[PDB]
Motif scaffolding. Structure first.
Motif, short mmCIF file in Angstrom:
data_model
loop_
_atom_site.label_atom_id
_atom_site.label_comp_id
_atom_site.label_asym_id
_atom_site.label_seq_id
_atom_site.Cartn_x
_atom_site.Cartn_y
_atom_site.Cartn_z
N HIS A 199 22.72 60.88 39.92
CA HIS A 199 23.09 61.64 38.50
C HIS A 199 23.91 60.83 38.09
CE1 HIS A 199 26.64 61.40 41.72
NE2 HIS A 199 25.25 61.39 42.51
N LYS A 203 24.64 68.29 54.05
CA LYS A 203 25.90 68.35 54.50
C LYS A 203 26.94 69.89 53.71
CE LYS A 203 28.23 68.55 50.78
NZ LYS A 203 29.17 67.96 49.79
N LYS A 259 21.67 72.69 53.89
CA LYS A 259 20.77 73.83 53.16
C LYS A 259 19.10 72.69 53.15
CE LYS A 259 22.73 77.98 50.63
NZ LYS A 259 22.97 77.87 52.07
N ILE A 307 18.66 73.70 47.56
CA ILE A 307 19.54 73.28 46.39
C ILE A 307 19.04 72.67 45.20
CG2 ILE A 307 21.56 71.73 46.44
CD1 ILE A 307 21.84 72.88 49.19
N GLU A 330 26.63 79.86 49.14
CA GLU A 330 26.47 77.84 48.62
C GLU A 330 25.99 76.82 49.45
OE1 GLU A 330 23.55 77.80 46.38
OE2 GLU A 330 25.02 79.61 45.70
N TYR A 335 29.03 75.20 50.91
CA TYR A 335 31.07 75.15 50.96
C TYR A 335 31.94 76.08 51.90
CZ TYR A 335 28.72 73.10 46.68
OH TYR A 335 27.93 72.48 45.76
N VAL A 366 33.01 68.88 53.13
CA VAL A 366 32.18 69.05 52.16
C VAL A 366 32.19 69.28 50.86
CG1 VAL A 366 30.85 71.36 51.77
CG2 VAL A 366 31.01 70.10 54.50
N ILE A 367 33.08 69.53 50.19
CA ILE A 367 33.25 70.10 49.10
C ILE A 367 33.88 68.87 48.86
CG2 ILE A 367 34.85 71.50 47.27
CD1 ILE A 367 35.17 73.30 48.63
N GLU A 368 33.53 67.88 48.01
CA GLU A 368 33.72 67.17 47.30
C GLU A 368 34.79 67.42 45.95
OE1 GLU A 368 30.45 64.31 46.15
OE2 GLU A 368 32.19 64.15 43.78
N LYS A 419 26.01 67.23 38.99
CA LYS A 419 25.61 66.67 39.88
C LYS A 419 23.86 66.38 39.69
CE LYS A 419 27.72 64.74 43.64
NZ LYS A 419 28.27 64.62 45.01
N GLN A 420 23.44 66.83 38.74
CA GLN A 420 22.07 66.59 38.58
C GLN A 420 21.72 67.73 39.04
OE1 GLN A 420 20.82 64.88 35.91
NE2 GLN A 420 19.07 66.04 36.34
N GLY A 421 22.27 69.18 39.53
CA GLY A 421 21.83 70.08 39.99
C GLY A 421 22.32 69.98 41.40
N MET A 422 22.52 68.98 42.02
CA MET A 422 23.42 68.90 43.10
C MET A 422 24.17 69.95 43.69
SD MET A 422 23.23 65.29 44.50
CE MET A 422 21.64 64.09 43.27
N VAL A 456 27.20 72.96 41.65
CA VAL A 456 27.27 74.35 41.31
C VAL A 456 28.21 73.98 40.55
CG1 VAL A 456 27.26 76.61 42.51
CG2 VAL A 456 25.93 75.18 43.80
N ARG A 489 21.92 78.30 38.52
CA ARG A 489 20.51 78.11 39.13
C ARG A 489 20.55 79.82 39.13
NH1 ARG A 489 22.85 76.81 43.51
NH2 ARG A 489 21.87 77.00 45.50
N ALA A 547 30.29 70.76 43.85
CA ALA A 547 29.93 69.81 44.21
C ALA A 547 30.85 68.61 45.42
CB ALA A 547 29.50 68.71 43.20
#
Lengths: 212, 79, 122, 156, 131
Positions: free
Chosen positions: D74, D147, D150, D155, E42, E44, E72-74, E97-100, E102, E115, E131
């Motif tokens: 990414h 993390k 899922k 995802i 999601e 998070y 978890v929530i970076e 993050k390239q789709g990682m 939300v 998405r 993310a």
RNA sequence: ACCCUGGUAGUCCACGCCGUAAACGAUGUCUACUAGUCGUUGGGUCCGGACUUAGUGACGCAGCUAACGCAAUAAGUA
RNA sequence: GCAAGCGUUAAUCGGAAUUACUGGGCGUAAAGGGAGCGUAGGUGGCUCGAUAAGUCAGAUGUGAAAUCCCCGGGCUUAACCUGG
RNA sequence: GGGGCAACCCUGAUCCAGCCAUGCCGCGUGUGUGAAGAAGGCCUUUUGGUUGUAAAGCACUUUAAGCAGUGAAGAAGACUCCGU
RNA sequence: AAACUGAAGAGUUUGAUCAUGGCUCAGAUUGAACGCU
């Protein structure tokens, strides 16, 4: 314009054999050099740099195929616009040149002699699908899948061609070229793959050089 | 055809009103929507609507030098 | 700068003026040499630099630098003037093109001949 | 079986009663070329000893990086103090588009095709460290999915 | 005073996760519950519940998650703020993050992921990147 | 000039002008959230302490910072 | 190193995130107005409705051709021309 | 395109030609082979190195230019005759 | 089927350093001019 001066000078500057001379004798004994680049000093102190490794790599390919900077940068500009890897595309389009194709098919001992044969209208090309040959004096003709190459009817008795096939046999014939010595006629079945091309030319350095 | 709604900011001309049309223009570089407003004179034949009213107007042939819209509806009136 | 501040004010760039105003956005310019003299350079260097005050067709009267070893310029000499400032010479901001109109090329030049107007020796 | 490259060598000085004491600082980056990477700088009165000391420090300042088999997973934007670095994944054959300090870390870590840009100060050590921070903070789709609890299909 | 409710919600979440708090509580709202439910679905945050307090008031409590001791929530950043709102079409929703990650999108069909909005072929206001 | 002895405007008052200071926390205002410890001022509630408030200080995490340093009176997160 | 061209000058953008929208800063590096009150403006709590202007989606009309890009075709190749 | 029923006339639009490396693209100025590694130049520790297979010699080739032939396509078939 | 591909820094302030910050350079382009050819 093309380079006319000595070729072993070029080979010595690139530090590798560019195939500029014929294979009639080993490259080591042809020059008793290539351990040092040309000039008074040759092997030097003050080691090279990233830009020197890139410049020398680009000059290596340019001197191998006999293509000057303007045409070679047009090649790179086309390769970076075609789909896929830019260096792979640039090697494919340098290999698909008519003079290089006839050299690999073996009608010429060196790429310079192959270009000299092409330029003097001694090679006819038959485009894929076309039911006709046509004499073509342009070394930079890109050959597509299936293009046929043949020798002129008034130059099949050439001595230089007949001693160029026997060198091609001693050197090796590519599998993407179907050449017949019986009537001096090859066929360009497909542009060569990067795995078919030697794994000692770092096209990645050329691609990084043409990025400022 | 080409209808436009807005508040009446002036009515002190015979058979004529001024309508304030508001719009949201977006900045071409900064992308925030500024609220801009144009004064358009309309033709109100019977001279009925007063300032502070919501009115609909449509484009027509010019009635005067600076008047080419005409009143068609007084949707809201001063409280 | 908030978004509202950017809309109300807007970020402006200053456009810098040219360093060669006497050329008037032209590659070269013709002038007459009103004075050919020598001058001393700035602090580190020491020489007698050859310069000519030249009035150009644009109405300017700037001082320029004669490059190369030896020249033939005197009062009322017609020179072609190119841009390019001399670092150690205060005030000089143009070069004299040597070999263009009346400024001769350099006599015994061999290496960088085109930069000094010297014909290829036979 | 490890790849090493020297990025920069600087000559520094210290003032004493006699005069100036000149020493050398070398910054090197070591890596396997398969995801293991690390950097280190050494100081010594001689360049070869500074270089060996930098290599020794780099061999101990190592991290592991999960690459996308040629490139990054990414876009990454990282910083160390005043050097801000940005890397994004590129298509195969693109090459490492980078300055010297970014290129050292990426090439020795095994990245082949990546776009990069340095903002702020281009101090070689701080740019190396910011690139190193970004590569160590980079995530993988599998790790993100684990993390969140899922699947990588859940995802995108 | 407080003029960004969504920004305050995300700031509370971010500060609680930086401080390693078990949960974060705030005054509730349907918009806040929609965003919190999207975060829950999601993955998070663990859960988000509303408790009805007196005086017609409500408390939204969100149980945070930690993976290997890290939050978890970076990163959770607001994209469309009250001073500059960002509305995008279906083909301009920015990926995280390239789709990682939300991009939370407020569409006419409600709060949903970037998405999900792309699959529904619908744009909206891009409110945050998590993310 | 600094030091000494004198010394006038000014400093004081009234009413007006001036509108500037290293007018400084060299830190715009407002809002929310984010370990803790010890003082002090003005309230308040409980049992000499405990707690809670609004100020005012000294420390000190995380975070931030080029560094110094800031750190619920942020230069942290928005 | 380029090559029937090669350099210099002029000029524009880039590098310059060096006007920062993407994408910067303001304790000490340049940078918080001496402080306040307030006008235009900017922004703005919770809940249930209405509306549908912003927003989003769809359809239609238009957005000339050339150019840019993609797939091809014709010049011996290429430039160039040319169909979609 | 203008006029004329036509024949035709007009058209510095246009289609061409001339000049200019002004740019883009293309091609050439040869190609192989050739060592006690000649001479000369340069450097040098005064004897080596480098120019350098580079040259000479030998073996070929004739693109482009030059000469001589041949020779499309750009033309839309006017007028006139016949038939419907 | 395709039109969806793209991003490099360096020098220079100090005894040295990190930051700030200007200046300068490597690129592309032209209805170009000039110089050598």
């Amino acid at each position: 314009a093309r380079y006319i001066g000595p070729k072993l000078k070029l080979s010595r500057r690139e530090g590798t054999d560019l195939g500029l001379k014929s294979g009639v004798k080993p490259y080591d004994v042809k020059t008793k050099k290539a351990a040092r680049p040309p000039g008074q000093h040759g092997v030097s102190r003050n080691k090279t740099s990233e830009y020197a490794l890139q410049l020398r790599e680009k000059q290596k390919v340019k001197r191998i195929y006999g293509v000057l900077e303007r045409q070679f940068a047009n090649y790179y500009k086309e390769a970076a616009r075609k789909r896929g890897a830019t260096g792979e595309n640039l090697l494919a389009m340098l290999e698909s040149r008519l003079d290089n194709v006839v050299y690999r098919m073996g009608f010429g001992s060196t790429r310079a002699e192959a270009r000299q044969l092409v330029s003097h209208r001694t090679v006819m090309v038959k485009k894929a699908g076309r039911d006709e040959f046509v004499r073509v004096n342009i070394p930079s003709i890109q050959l597509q899948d299936g293009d046929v190459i043949a020798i002129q009817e008034k130059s099949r008795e050439q001595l230089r061609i007949k001693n160029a096939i026997e060198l091609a046999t001693q050197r090796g014939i590519p599998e993407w070229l179907d050449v017949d010595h019986s009537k001096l006629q090859g066929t360009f079945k497909k542009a060569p793959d990067r795995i078919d091309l030697p794994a000692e030319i770092n096209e990645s350095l050329i691609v990084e050089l043409y990025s400022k | 055809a080409s209808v436009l709604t807005g508040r009446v900011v002036s009515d002190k001309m015979d058979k004529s009103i001024t309508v304030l049309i508001e719009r949201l223009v977006r900045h071409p570089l900064y992308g925030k929507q500024l609220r801009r407003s144009t004064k358009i004179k309309a033709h109100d034949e019977n001279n009925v609507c007063q300032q502070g009213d919501l009115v609909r107007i449509k484009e027509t042939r010019p009635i005067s030098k600076t008047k080419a819209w005409t009143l068609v509806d007084v949707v809201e009136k001063v409280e | 700068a908030t978004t509202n501040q950017l809309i109300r004010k807007g970020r402006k760039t200053i456009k810098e003026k040219s360093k060669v105003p006497a050329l008037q956005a032209c590659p070269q310019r013709r002038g007459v040499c009103t004075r050919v003299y020598t001058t001393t350079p700035k602090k580190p260097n020491s020489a007698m630099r050859k310069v000519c005050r030249v009035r150009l067709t644009s109405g300017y009267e700037v001082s320029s630098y004669i490059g190369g070893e030896g020249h033939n310029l005197q009062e009322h000499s017609v020179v072609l003037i190119r841009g390019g400032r001399v670092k150690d010479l205060p005030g000089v901001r143009y070069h004299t093109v040597r070999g263009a109109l009346d400024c001769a090329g350099v006599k015994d030049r061999k290496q960088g001949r085109s930069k000094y107007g010297a014909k290829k020796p036979k | 079986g490890l790849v090493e490259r020297l990025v920069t060598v600087d000559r520094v000085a210290k003032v004493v009663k006699g005069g100036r004491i000149f020493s050398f600082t070398a910054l090197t980056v070591v890596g396997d070329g398969n995801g293991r990477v690390g950097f280190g700088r050494g100081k010594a009165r001689e360049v070869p000893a500074a270089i060996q000391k930098a290599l020794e420090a780099a061999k101990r300042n190592m991290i592991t990086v999960e690459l996308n088999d040629a490139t990054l997973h990414h876009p990454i934007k990282a910083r160390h103090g005043a050097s801000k670095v940005y890397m994004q994944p590129a298509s195969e054959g693109t090459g490492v588009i980078a300055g010297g300090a970014m290129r050292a870390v990426l090439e020795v870590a095994g990245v082949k095709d990546v776009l990069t840009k340095c903002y702020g100060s281009t101090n070689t050590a701080n740019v190396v460290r910011a690139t190193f921070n970004g590569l160590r903070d980079m995530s993988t789709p599998e790790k993100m999915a684990a993390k969140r609890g899922k699947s990588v299909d859940e995802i995108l | 005073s407080m003029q960004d409710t969504v920004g305050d919600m995300l700031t509370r979440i971010r500060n609680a996760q930086m401080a390693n708090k078990v949960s974060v509580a705030m005054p509730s709202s349907k918009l806040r519950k929609s965003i919190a439910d999207l975060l829950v679905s999601e993955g998070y945050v663990a859960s988000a519940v509303v408790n009805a307090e007196e005086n017609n008031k409500a408390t939204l409590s969100i149980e945070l998650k930690y993976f290997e001791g890290k939050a978890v929530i970076e990163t959770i950043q607001r994209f469309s703020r009250p001073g500059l709102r960002q509305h995008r079409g279906k083909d301009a929703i920015p990926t995280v993050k390239q789709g990682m990650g939300v991009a939370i999108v407020s569409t006419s069909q409600g709060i949903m992921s970037d998405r999900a909005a792309r699959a529904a072929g619908i744009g909206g206001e891009v409110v945050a990147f998590v993310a």
